[PDB]
Every structure is written in structure tokens, then in C-alpha cells.
Amino acid sequence: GSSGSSGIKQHCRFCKKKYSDVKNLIKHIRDMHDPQD
Ligand SMILES: [Zn+2]
């Protein structure tokens, strides 16, 4: 196909886990790591 929703999946920079979108990754970061400083 000439176009599609490819490459949208994301990874945690702290614990190297994976998510199919950025918003569930941001919730994971705020719940498990919280890089506030
Ligand atoms: Zn993580």
C-alpha cells in the first residue's frame, strides 16, 4: 500500500517496555518513573 498507520508504536526510555501509542506510554512514565526534575 502507498500509505498506512506504520511506525506509530513507542518505547520506555527507562525500563525498555513497549506501547502501541504515546499516551499509554506517558501514563506508564508518570506511574512508574515520574521524571519531574
Ligand atoms: Zn518504563
UniProtKB/Swiss-Prot annotation:
Q: Which residues bind Zn(2+) 4?
A: 12, 15, 28, 33
Native species:
Mus musculus
Identify this protein by name.
Zinc finger protein ZFAT
> Found in which tissues?
Detected in spleen and thymus but not in liver, muscle, heart, kidney, brain, bone marrow or pancreas. Expressed in CD19+, CD4+ and CD8+ lymphocytes but not in CD11b+ lymphocytes or peritoneal macrophages (at protein level).
Q: Which residues of the full protein are shown?
A: 352 to 381 of 1237
Where is the secretion signal located?
A: none
User: Out of the domains of life, which is the source?
Assistant: Eukaryota
Q: Where in the cell is it found?
A: Nucleus; Cytoplasm, Cytosol
Q: What does this protein do?
A: May be involved in transcriptional regulation. Overexpression causes down-regulation of a number of genes involved in the immune response. Some genes are also up-regulated.
Zinc finger spans (C2H2-type)? 10-33
